[PDB]
Design a protein around this ligand. Sequence first.
Ligand SMILES: CN1[C@@H]2CC[C@H]1C[C@@H](OC(=O)[C@H](CO)c1ccccc1)C2
Ligand SMILES: O=C(O)CCC(=O)C(=O)O
Ligand SMILES: [Fe+2]
Ligand SMILES: [Sr+2]
Ligand SMILES: [Sr+2]
Length: 324
Amino acid sequence: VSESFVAPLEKRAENDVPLGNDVPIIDLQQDHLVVVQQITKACQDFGLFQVINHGLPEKLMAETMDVCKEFFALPAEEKEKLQPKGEPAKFELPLEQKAKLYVEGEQAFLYWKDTLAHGCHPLDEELVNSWPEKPATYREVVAKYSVEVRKLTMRILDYICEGLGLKLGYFDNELSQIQMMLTNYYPPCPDPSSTLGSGGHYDGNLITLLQQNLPGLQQLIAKWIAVEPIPTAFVVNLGLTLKVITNEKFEGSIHRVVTNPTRDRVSIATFIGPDYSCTIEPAKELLSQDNPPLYKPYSYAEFGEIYLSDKSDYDAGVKPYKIN
Ligand SMILES: CN1[C@@H]2CC[C@H]1C[C@@H](OC(=O)[C@H](CO)c1ccccc1)C2
Ligand SMILES: O=C(O)CCC(=O)C(=O)O
Ligand SMILES: [Fe+2]
Ligand SMILES: [Sr+2]
Ligand SMILES: [Sr+2]
């Protein structure tokens, strides 16, 4: 592989990462209180769990994976239409909601990944008109998927509210206003020992729902485990923003993606979180002398700039705001 994609020795993935047998798989059609308790335990102990019987149509999940794979099969001449000034966009502020293809790495090497990203909320003609023109059915399918994934995310956030003792709808406001859909394409890699599909990270936002069909996702528990792909499940990743708002009562998910020498992989990640204008702080309702705030209030925009640039540590984004 090109030296551009060679990860530092210490960040390279071990060849035989064991299956995460303790990754919670939570049936959302259990009794209400059982679902609240199981989600609460997973959030406190792991920060990553899967949800099944989640009420999002399996047919729509399959149709969305199909049109996302069809997009990445498009020829160069079509993909160039999403490359501003002839190259992929960077994950940097301002992060626009119009569809673009993105490159990503650490500042230095590149991740073995192409990412299509666009905003999904609120859905209006202006936003959907800025989405991919091809495939023809992308806009129709992903509009429906967007609404359904948001519905499921807001259900999970209200289970989280009951678990924390926050009023229902606590996150149904500026804290969930941005919905970025990242479709990740991992082409086959001639040397998986040297490369990463995605470097180890927290998702910086509030909560992320990840749809996957194939292996490659790994979680840090300095031990890495493999997250079993369940094609009809969503992987729920708690973000660094939720870690801060819960005053570390919940864990954030630290995860990475490894490359494969034989086959490509598409994942669909729905990133829900605050507007860039938001102030982030530990929920005052949960604070006391027994539970003092571990973070001072901060600008999400200021956090965002550090989070997207500084990868010296997983929580480099929030280190400046740590107190007590
Ligand atoms: C693998 N990388 C990680 C996670 C996804 C991908 C791109 C980047 O994450 C984002 O762009 C998200 C979008 O909501 C973001 C942006 C600013 C603040 C909080 C979150 C870093
Ligand atoms: O491809 C995956 O399974 C993970 C994607 C991811 O973590 C991300 O886009 O932030
Ligand atoms: Fe992620
Ligand atoms: Sr180009
Ligand atoms: Sr357009």
